[PDB]
Amino acid sequence: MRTFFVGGNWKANPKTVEEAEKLIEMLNGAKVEGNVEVVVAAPFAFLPTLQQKLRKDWKVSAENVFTKPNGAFTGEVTVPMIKSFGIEWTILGHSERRDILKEDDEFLAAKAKFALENGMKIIYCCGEHLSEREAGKASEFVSAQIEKMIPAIPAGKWDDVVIAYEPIWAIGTGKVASTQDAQEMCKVIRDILAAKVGADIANKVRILYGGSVKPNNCNELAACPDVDGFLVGGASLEPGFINIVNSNVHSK
């Protein structure tokens, strides 16, 4: 059985380092049940304090990295800088970066390859927008994203890759995703992997649900067979985050 995986994506929150520290202290007191791999992703400026203060059985993640080790890239943070603090993870391809900062698949594949070849682990995000959902072309769209990601992954590095599905069609559109939607799309992804890189890799890669996950749905979601965990949004800043970590006991 793949180890259940929960990443808390703080996104661009909280506003202050003091709030970040308060949040860390709460996470540090949380009683985790079952077996689960927990990763906490935070704004670059809070990464040193999170790496310093966060419980050592959890790991810290960046929310992005650039494509190069260093250089003439004002404003960008790079893998070596992250690693210098002992941080081992980054998110890549989040819908907010693809949409608002205009990150394209070519840029993202270059980041996945560079990250992995430099010893990072990645949470690689994908997912379709409203029109493709309506057209019944979700699988196709998600497939093309995964097919762009596949060639990026170096030999021997699938152990260091986690994929998160984001129902972007359910974000601010007036439409909501169901538990079955999550299961269907995670299965879609696993089957793409199986066809393209083989069953052994498909069976080991954790595929996460990255839509709205809260204490009131995490248990039903976790129980879905192809849902291996979550990339949590707003609840990662709240006490309910622990409920979501602990939903691993409902997944088999």
Binding positions for Na ion, rule: CB under 5 A:
136, 156, 159, 227, 251
Instruction: Check binding of 12 to a second copy (CB under 8 A).
Output: yes
Q: Which is nearer to Na ion, 156 or 172 (CB)?
A: 156
Q: What is the smallest separation between the CB atom of 60 and a second copy, expressed in angstroms?
A: 11
Rounded distance between C-alpha atoms, residue 5 and residue 124, angstroms: 13
Rounded distance between C-alpha atoms, residue 172 and residue 129, angstroms: 11
Cis ω for the linkage preceding 43 (within 30 of 0) = no
Rounded distance between C-alpha atoms, residue 13 and residue 220, angstroms: 27
Task: List the single partner that 216 binds among a second copy, Na ion, none, CB under 5 to 8 Å by kind.
Answer: none
Convert residues 179-208 into a mask of x (bound to a second copy by CB under 8 A) and - (unbound).
------------------------------
Judge residue 148's burial from the number of C-beta atoms within 10 Å of its C-beta, 0-12 exposed, 13-18 middle, 19 or more buried: middle
Convert residues 93-112 into a mask of x (bound to a second copy by CB under 8 A) and - (unbound).
-x-xx--xxx----------
Q: Which of residues 32, 81, 194, 197 is near a second copy by CB under 8 A? A: 81
* Strand stretches in 87-222, DSSP E: 89-92, 121-126, 161-165, 207-209
Q: Select which of 63, 94, 96, 128 is catalytic.
A: 94
166 catalytic per annotation: yes
Task: List the single partner that 166 binds among Na ion, a second copy, none, CB under 5 to 8 Å by kind.
Answer: none
Three-class DSSP category at 34: coil
Beta partners for residue 13, in sequence order: none
Output the CA–CA distances (angstroms, integers) from residue 15 to 49, 81, 197, 216, in the order listed: 14, 22, 42, 26
Task: List the single partner that 70 binds among Na ion, a second copy, none, CB under 5 to 8 Å by kind.
Answer: a second copy
Q: Which is nearer to Na ion, 21 or 220 (CB)?
A: 220
Three-class DSSP category at 65: coil
User: Tell me, what amino acid is at 17?
Assistant: V
Q: Which is nearer to a second copy, 16 or 131 (CB)?
A: 16
Label residue 102 left, alpha or beta by phi (over 0 means left) and psi (-120 to 50 means alpha): left
Q: Which is nearer to a second copy, 88 or 220 (CB)?
A: 88
Instruction: Check binding of 228 to a second copy (CB under 8 A).
Output: no
Q: What is the smallest separation between the CB atom of 154 and a second copy, expressed in angstroms?
A: 20
Q: Select which of 63, 103, 128, 166 is catalytic.
A: 166
Tell me which stretch binds a second copy (CB under 8 A): 22-30, 89-97, 130-138, 211-219: 89-97
Cα 39–Cα 41–Cα 45 angle in degrees, nearest 5? 140
94 catalytic per annotation: yes
Task: List the single partner that 156 binds among a second copy, Na ion, none, CB under 5 to 8 Å by kind.
Answer: Na ion
> Any idea which residues carry the catalytic annotation?
94, 166
